[PDB]
Amino acid sequence: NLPEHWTDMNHQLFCMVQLEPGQSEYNTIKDKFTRTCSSYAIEKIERIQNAFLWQSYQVKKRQMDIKNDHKNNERLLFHGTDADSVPYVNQHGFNRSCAGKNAVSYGKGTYFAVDASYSAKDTYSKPDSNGRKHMYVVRVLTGVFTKGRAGLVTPPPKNPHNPTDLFDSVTNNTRSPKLFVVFFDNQAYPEYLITFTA
Amino acid sequence: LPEHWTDMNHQLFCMVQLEPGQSEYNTIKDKFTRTCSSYAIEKIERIQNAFLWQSYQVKKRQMDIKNDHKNNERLLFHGTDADSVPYVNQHGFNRSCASYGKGTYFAVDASYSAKDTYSKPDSNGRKHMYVVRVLTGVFTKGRAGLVTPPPKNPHNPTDLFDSVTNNTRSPKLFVVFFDNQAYPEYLITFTA
Lengths: 198, 192
Ligand SMILES: [Cl-]
Ligand code: NA
Ligand code: NA
Fold this sequence. Notes:
By secondary structure, chain A is of the alpha+beta class. The first copy, chain A, is about 20% helix and about 30% strand. In chain A, the strands form two sheets. A five-stranded antiparallel β-sheet of chain A has the order 1-2-9-5-3, with helices on both faces. The first copy, chain A, has a four-stranded mixed β-sheet with strand order 4-8-7-6. It is classed as transferase.
């Protein structure tokens, strides 16, 4: 049941759609990026249309919407990546088994930044052999969250006497969240890919 | 939500103890006793987890569409220790807890899962294994260190097998690498 602003893909399941700088769609992403990354320059922004990831992600959104009490369950966040991971992410999304350590670790899952500046660090968005850096703009199901800790393999339980009722994600700091970690597949939809440069 | 599930009173999760001697129980007990006739069954419970089921069915449909006329689903076993039972009931099998890859492992034969290393006897001597619907799909031989299955063709590196196995001609185990590929359908509590 695919979004109606999507390009018609003609029975195909995957497509990257190049956005056009006049569009509000392009400019809102650009502005979100330049909020913290004004020193960097955008080459192109591509919309990612992946039917299967979209469908699995939306089911999990519905479930989290049901389980949580009228919460705002989804945030739009950034993830820097190397060029070599781009084909995999476009197709298969974010895999906790493939994630690198963060400089500051709040668990073993996939990290998503509030600020594009964070993701824009050479450590996360490594320059390809042409100087191009790569960052995804992601819908992430952050749900209800707590401060994480380095050893986490899943989010911690809300209550220790009920170990299976879990927070949806973890953050560095619940007062001022700058990162969120997710620990399950299809909890994050890669919506746009920003190609950018110095 | 499948028909043989019994009414949930608008709940999204429950465990339903099966009635011995009726068809559902006999079908699952037969699968088990095929290889573990020396073990005693204490009870079998049907796991009715609406959220896991929904995500599993989504993936089953996608794989049915993606694969050329394949039988993508198998019934397999998984031994678990007692302390992991509430987690699995609620959230399934997680590769991040857990020789042929860093995924979750499912046995063809209940005998494999009956091993104490997999279905660790609790304090009462009670062992636990699941009967599991697994999206095995198109599979290939696994090997250590895999974090996803290999690509079907090394020239389309993102087009992946669905699962791996120890032996493709005669598989005794399957390894899946994602969260929506294994539904815990029944829990068998039993003794040696
Ligand atoms: Cl097992
Ligand atoms: Na709700
Ligand atoms: Na098909």
